């Protein structure tokens, strides 16, 4: 057998997602493409954030990505930051940033 994932060229589980769509919206029929399309968008997005989190990890001179890296990745990217309004990254931390008025002397 050949996983639908392979057929469509994705890593994410196409079938597993047709199932998750059903267990969630029973009523509707799911075109054979929807779970496909879904898995493709989700792998895309996850790829995007991993690309940034990895770099973030590497600059930090770390061989393993952590939540703080994912934050900094998402925090510094305008659109991922937008996509994640009201999302709290546990153990994530905050973007360092001091307001100028707080720096002393003259």
């Amino acid at each position: 057998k050949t996983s639908r994932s392979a057929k469509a060229g994705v890593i994410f589980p196409v079938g597993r997602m047709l199932r998750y769509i059903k267990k969630g919206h029973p009523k509707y029929r799911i075109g054979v493409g929807a779970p496909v399309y879904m898995a493709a968008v989700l792998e895309y997005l996850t790829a995007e954030i991993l690309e940034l989190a990895v770099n973030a990890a590497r600059d930090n001179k770390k061989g393993r990505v952590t939540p703080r890296h994912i934050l900094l990745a998402v925090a510094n990217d305008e659109e991922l930051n937008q996509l994640l309004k009201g999302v709290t990254i546990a153990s994530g931390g905050v973007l360092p940033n001091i307001h100028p008025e707080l720096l002393a002397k003259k």
Binding site: V94, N97, H99, A104
Partner: protein, 98 residues
Amino acid sequence: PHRYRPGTVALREIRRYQKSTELLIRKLPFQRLVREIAQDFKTDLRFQSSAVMALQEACEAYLVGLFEDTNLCAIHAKRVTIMPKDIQLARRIRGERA
């Protein structure tokens, strides 16, 4: 006797705490708080360890944000010291003022 001027250590702290990610509230004192409140709602409850931690994650995040906005408000009033009326303006604009 050496001694930093007022404000030098704070900026030290800010850089310090903005670089890290550990929780800033004592865990046990917080757990008592969570149970005290829950108890005052429904007696004989149990909490998954993770639940308490989920709650503390949520709480600390929440206040760190309220503090960021509170700080915009102080600075907006040409101040560097946050005050209650700062927290109040931030909360009000956020829709919380309930």
